[model samples]
Target: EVETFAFQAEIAQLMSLIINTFYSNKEIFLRELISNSSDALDKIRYESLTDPSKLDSGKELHINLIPNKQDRTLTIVDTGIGMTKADLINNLGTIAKSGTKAFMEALQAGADISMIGQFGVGFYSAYLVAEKVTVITKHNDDEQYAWESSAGGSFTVRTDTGEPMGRGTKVILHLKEDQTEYLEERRIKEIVKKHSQFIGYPITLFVEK
Candidate 1:
């Protein structure tokens, strides 16, 4: 399904604002990504309870944080309901929804700022620290697709090449020079605990021995 939507001018501006400055702390990128992974795992787990076929691929509810200190990259992989090409673009490229206009208007009219995060567009937070981001996902109903972006108004999606994992997603972040703190296991774990401890799935830090 090729889904597309035109962004309103204000909404476009809002997206730029989010990508540019909304997240004051860049470390929250790990937290947001893990939180999203946990949410995906929850969806798969719930569906598997009703449809045993869902578990045919293995049911593991966990998030893995693999940091490559040498390459200055960090990868967060999960076994969850992965996304297809259309789902990836629709979910990642655009704003929350049409209702975002009204929400922004309300915020300008003195609505509390805390409510903004509850809406969509949360995943884009990863771009704050990552110079380039890649998502490799394999959905149960669709072929594996890889999405790549520099968070600069352009992205590309194509069929992935690697042997498919039974199910789930992997997000690799090429960290920016100043964002090297994210490559530290201690820092990533601390940030995960600070913002994602209440999440429903296990968050693991993969380290080389």
Candidate 2:
């Protein structure tokens, strides 16, 4: 089943501001996404230290970047702590719903709310280059769910009827027509090097000859 949600009143304005604020520096989108993945990996690893069952069997911790030029899409797959359906909505659907009152204050004051040091706001950076984004995730406690949106207005969370995922999350970015540069393997490698060089997990890029 699929349920659609409109972005909270403030979230719409914030999303517009976020897009315009980073429009010129769109390359940072990769950095933000990679960092988000790393954080998920960190969470699962940390949790597994106490409850070994928190981890799925044989799933190595890593991030994989797959660019499909023919499809004009870039996909990031992470073997990390995935989200439940509620998490998709709570984390990605609305800013106000998350109870980030401090962030709301920052937005109200018109402060410089960079993605850096901001919890969860960095995910919105995907809008810089993607016309639409799809996130498929599976948590140890929940079945797979997919969240989809066109960078604003609204988003949908649906029970994934496709093949079961192995306890992780996958982010697929459908690039805007003018944003194909991100599909280049070399370009992605450079972005990871410059922005996420210190990320602990292996980040592999799938390149075809």
Candidate 3:
């Protein structure tokens, strides 16, 4: 089943404000996304330390950067703690609603799980480069779902019958024409090195010969 929702008036205004604010350095979109992926990966690893059942998915913890020139899309796949349908709507579709924030609140006092994302608006930076963004995610507690948006007034979330991601999130950015630089392996590597050099999990960029 598929359901479409419109961005609330305040969210629409916030989204526009965020996109314009980060338009100057368009490259930070990758940085923000990679950071989000790292946070998710960290959350799952931290959780599994106490509740081993979270690791039942059997997926390794890492991040993959795949660029397709033919399709003009850059995809970031992370085998981490994925989101449920409610999480997708609250975290991505709304402002200041971060899964990481919720996770922190649910934790016991002094539980030290370090996360890089704070504002919850970092995901909106994808609009700086992408014409459309699609997020397909599966959590241990929820079935897989796909959330898609063009940073417009509305977004869609549906049951994802396409690929079984097991347990994680895959963010597909359909790059705008001028944003092709991100599709290059060298450029992405440079960005990752400059920003996320010390990121814990392996960040791999797929190169097709």
Candidate 4:
């Protein structure tokens, strides 16, 4: 079944600001996405230390950055701890994190600052340069599902019929007409090198021979 969820009131407002204000330096979106992927990988690895089965995939966790100039899509894939349906609902559909609302409020108060999205909502930052964002993820215990949105204050989540990503999340960013620069391999590799070089997991750019 396909389900639709609207962004919370405060989240809707914050997303608006992210899109219209402070729109410069959009490349940072990749950094934020990579950071989140690292965090997820860390979480699963930590859990595996306690429950051996958590790492059943037996493969090293890593992030894959794939650029498709033909489709104008840039995909970030992570073999990390994927989210359940409920996880998607809470994480993507609302401002469930404590400091997110407060951070957004401070921004509205004319507090000039770069909001470090440690709480959550950083995923939505993809909308800054993407016309559409598609998330396909598979949790160890949950079925694979997908979430997609156009940053129109609402999103839809549905079970994916595609092959399982094994155990992780794949985010495909459909670059905006003018944001096609992200499709360039050099541009993405540079961003990964400059911003996420020190991240815990590997950030490999997907290239085909």
Error of 1 at 15 (Å): 4.6
Q: Candidate 2: which stretches are off by over 4 Å?
A: 20-22, 91-119
Whole-model lDDT per candidate:
0.74, 0.80, 0.80, 0.81
Clash tally, candidates in order: 0, 0, 0, 0
Cα lDDT of model 3 by residue, 162-207, tens digit: 9698899999999999889999889998999988999899988998
**Worst lDDT window (10 residues) for model 4?**
111-120
Q: What is the TM-score of each candidate against the true structure?
A: 0.83, 0.87, 0.85, 0.91
Cα RMSD for candidate 3? 6.7
Give candidates' CA RMSD values in order: 3.6, 2.6, 6.7, 2.0
For this target, which candidate reaches the highest lDDT against the unseen true structure?
Answer: 4
Q: What TM-score quantifies how close candidate 2 is to the native fold?
A: 0.87
Error of 4 at 30 (Å): 0.6
- Angstrom error of the Cα, residue 206, model 4: value is 1.6
- In model 3, what lDDT does residue 195 have? 82
Clash pairs, model 3 backbone:
none
Per-residue lDDT, model 4, residue 201, is 78
- C-alpha lDDT (0 to 100) for residue 27 of candidate 1: 69
Looking at model 1, the pairs that clash are none
**In model 2, what are the clashing residue pairs, if there are any?**
none
Model 3 residue 21 CA deviation (Å) reads 5.7
